[PDB]
Design a protein around this nucleic acid. Sequence first.
RNA 1: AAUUUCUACUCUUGUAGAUGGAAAUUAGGUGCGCUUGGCA
DNA 2: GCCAAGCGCACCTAATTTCCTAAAGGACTG
DNA 3: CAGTCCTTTA
Length: 1272
Amino acid sequence: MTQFEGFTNLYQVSKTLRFELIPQGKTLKHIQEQGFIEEDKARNDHYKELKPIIDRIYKTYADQCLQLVQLDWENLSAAIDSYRKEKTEETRNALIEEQATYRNAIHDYFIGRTDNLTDAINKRHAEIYKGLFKAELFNGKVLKQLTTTEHENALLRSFDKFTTYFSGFYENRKNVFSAEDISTAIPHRIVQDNFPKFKENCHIFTRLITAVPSLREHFENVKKAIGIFVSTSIEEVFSFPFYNQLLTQTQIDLYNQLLGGISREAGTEKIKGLNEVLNLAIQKNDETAHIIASLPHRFIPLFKQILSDRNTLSFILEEFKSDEEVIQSFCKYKTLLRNENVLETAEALFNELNSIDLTHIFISHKKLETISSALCDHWDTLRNALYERRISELTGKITKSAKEKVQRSLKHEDINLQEIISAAGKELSEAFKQKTSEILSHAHAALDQPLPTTLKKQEEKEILKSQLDSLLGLYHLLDWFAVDESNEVDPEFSARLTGIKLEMEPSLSFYNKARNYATKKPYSVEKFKLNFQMPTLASGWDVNKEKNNGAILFVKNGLYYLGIMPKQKGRYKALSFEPTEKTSEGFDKMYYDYFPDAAKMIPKCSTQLKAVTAHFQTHTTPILLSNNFIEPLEITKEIYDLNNPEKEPKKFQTAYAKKTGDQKGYREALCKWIDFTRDFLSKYTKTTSIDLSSLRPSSQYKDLGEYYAELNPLLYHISFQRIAEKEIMDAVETGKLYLFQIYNKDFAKGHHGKPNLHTLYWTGLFSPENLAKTSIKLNGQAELFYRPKSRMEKMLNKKLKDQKTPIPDTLYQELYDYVNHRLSHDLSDEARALLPNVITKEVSHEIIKDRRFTSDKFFFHVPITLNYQAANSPSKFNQRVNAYLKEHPETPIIGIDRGERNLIYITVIDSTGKILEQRSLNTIQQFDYQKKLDNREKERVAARQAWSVVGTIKDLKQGYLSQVIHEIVDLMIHYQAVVVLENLAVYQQFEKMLIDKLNCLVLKDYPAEKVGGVLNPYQLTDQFTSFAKMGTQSGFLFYVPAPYTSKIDPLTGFVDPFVWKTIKNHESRKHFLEGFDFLHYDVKTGDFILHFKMNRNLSFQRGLPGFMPAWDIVFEKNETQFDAKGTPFIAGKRIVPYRDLYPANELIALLEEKGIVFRDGSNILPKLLENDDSHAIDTMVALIRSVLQMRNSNAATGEDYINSPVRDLNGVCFDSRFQNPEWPMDADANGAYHIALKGQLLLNHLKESKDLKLQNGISNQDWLAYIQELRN
RNA sequence: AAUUUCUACUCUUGUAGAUGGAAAUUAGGUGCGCUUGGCA
DNA sequence: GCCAAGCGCACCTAATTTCCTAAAGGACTG
DNA sequence: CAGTCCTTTA
Ligand code: NA
């Protein structure tokens, strides 16, 4: 029998804590004298300079290995097809194995174990890959297999006797060449990223060529016109064998540029690619265009190779290199425009247009729509005015063919200025005159305005952009005129225009060159890693490593301290601190005794020793180890062969038992290995004294992971011993010990409130109850940072005299300027009405914005592990949760939904579907986070347009979501409920933050001993790995599809069954109305009733029969109803593209226009069909579509309600405008309600099942039939 | 309007909630400029 | 003005991998 | 030569 408090201590969770370090005594002084911080940055900067140089070895070697790859991808394609064909778990595992096989085939080119290459070439790669992740990179040996310059050689020697600084970097480069299913790797990018894209490209290609064969020669011309793949036809680049030549970045770039085309410098025609050719063919809007548009018509570009440098054949602008370079160069080009008098020449040309012949001044067709939008009401007016005047001068019977010829002519021909004026009216000339002088005056007012001295201030950046906008505005104006000699251009005008047009041409690149520099991020100060010339600083906390790592911890009178022991005179000298009797003044110094993962440390210290492996290469006799063993440990060939099988799975692993299938052999090898580890642990110096009597006999462990999950907690112990006070002050004065105080806001002197959750982890780690039984472990590989300084009366409360209501942001800064007596104008009306109810604080001490960044500070990052008694990973976590849910049928459900007018909307229901609580999370704690987020995004968009600093919105999102995470888990724990989400910005981040919080949930008000306390965290969600590897369920979290959660009637489950893309023409609309049985007027109730059988109109439905065989759709009588607050609204009102529609009144109007008698309950449909009015039937169909549109919304009105078109078995038509709290209050509440109900389906189907496995996915038909069977 | 850091704060030289760091890679987005076209 | 398919640039955002180590191994020093 | 200490490991 399970309980809710049983979901604790199920798997380990690792977190990192951050603190500030406060130097003590002479600590800060000795560091400045030894130059540690100075050389820590220099070594940091040498790393950043050397990293790209070292990457040349990886990039070159990886690129060289990928050039010889030749594989047959036919098997991989068949596994992809079979998984898309049948969605069974057998085809998934077949594809996963097939991908792993191909990843290893690529990996064998790196390590040199592929049968495709000869032994001489195959062995040469192994000699490189061996020393590819250690100090052999710096020998130049690997580069000798593939010449260093003096500065590079000087950079290599900067890490002499210090190559451990690249320790984590070595792991990042193993992630590049790894064969595992990790996205950081090259084999994964080839097999699972680019090939499915390339395989899809081949299918898109052949489908287009078969339907439109003319597209074949057209694609071939694009390939020949660019010059890519000259030795390969267009059909072969869309065949599988060519993908072997698409494994390097240069080939991937050429492949992507065949799809995307090539751009020259700005302002010139671009080389089109395959996707642009298809896009233009569709925009012709002919019969062929509709066929191409029906098929897939966009090839997918391949992803880049890992670590590779992207190449492009397009033009890259020259980058301005300094601040004054843009001022000196622009002012030089700016002062050149005065001497040439290009403004006076331009002002004279546009003044010529008042008297010269305008029938020879031509406007470009590529600019006609832009000019129409800049001088007239819309882009349409000019093209339409020319259309009407040209139709006005056609000859004879103006057919519709002659009109289409006039339309097509206006798309691709230059119009003379006279025909535009004669067709648009005199008001265009006034618009042309006003716009021309407006642009000319701004350019004239900008050439004489001097540039600033520097670009330091934003006000100086603005005037540079303002003058460039005026220059680009004149450059834009000149491009209005046609340049092609196909038109009869004026002799003098075309020569003078082309002259000043080419003299304004460099201004376009100056705009882009200036923006590419002025919008660059300013230099900011960043924290950097400290080492104190110790390559393994704070690597581990063990007592055997205190001299090597030079880091220990103290706790004195509730305060925590970090001690650093630097090298004295370039030599290590472990200043042995002497434990002393208690009560003597000093610090409780921690003694950290730890033996790491036994799965690797025991083989490392015994069975994998070089002497053991070498001995068993020749001899079969046992070998006895004596070094670091209190008694000799025996290694037999039977034991050595178990951990060195030469078969991929070791015989004591579950993989061997699951692959082979012999339980007699598996349980024998498992028992013989556990007995060997017990023999090791009893004799090894680090573990011989550890009492392991709690471990059960070896033959009782079912698998090895279960044994290691019980052994590792016994290999870690922490204890404290008092140290002499006088001994540390000596070690601090001499400089042999640097002492800091591990500090945060909860250790300030004035601190008196609740602690931060991270500090409860910290104090709980060192609580005496945790030292006896370890729940939280202190982990190694900590880091120290040093970030320099970054930045450089009366105060006002944000809330009123009552603490609940806040001052609006528009009135806060105005009141703060007033109480400080620095407001330079009259105080506004409402701000003066809020004056008496305002709370003012007197500045008793300076409170400085961003105080941490104004001074230099040290920082300390240390990782910990919670739930240390549990295993590293859980086993059957979802099945453990589902076992609880079957024993707790009344577990409520919390449905979280992403709304259209709400960031997050939640709805809590009980086990039977009744709503218990519904709320929008746009605002929480009386703060509108939606408006703040939306106003922040507007500011960031305007910042990019104004070349200002953009800023950060991710810090505002996390702060909002944290308040959301707090509110959701409270509802989760109070209700012991299940959270349901949508299956796929603000919502994606909320999902991860919710899983992480429930992976290791600690409530700061619970006592440490209780479930939920710091020593017994809650674990409600499955262990997070990645989003791709996650399924439908993660513990108490569930994911359901979003379709049919909003536009669904919460009283019946009804949805709109028809797809309106198929009801397109008159004959289809007539057959659609013939599928309905009757439509008549109810005299008593006053509304219309439309009866529809679900088995009719099958060609117009979405294929979802649901559960009801028929439905009574009603045209609700447009009465005036009132909600629970007395606010009026019209029943049946619909909002369509917006306008308000009243269908029942619009229907009565239609029937009276046709004289159709309906007040006798007569069936109306046969009368409309027999009369066969084209306009009346199309209106009748539109009315039905409006009635079936439940979700009616208009942003300006604030409306977003659900109004059901069907009446339930209880005679009610649901309308969220009644504001009944028992039911959804709007459309977003209706989504969250039905999301929780989709999760209820999963829990309802779990109890009827005999297994503990949830059903994967919810089909729309199973959901509609389920929810309709319930409500009817 | 102070913070390991973030958000919201101020009866309190601080309060409430949250907080996996670092390294590495990749993908996407926003804005601007430009090219060819579409806007029934 | 909007939109489509692209290209160049500026910066912002997030997903996914690794480690969270004492001790063996061995190159260098005195 | 063996101690020291950075490098590399399971
Ligand atoms: Na607090």
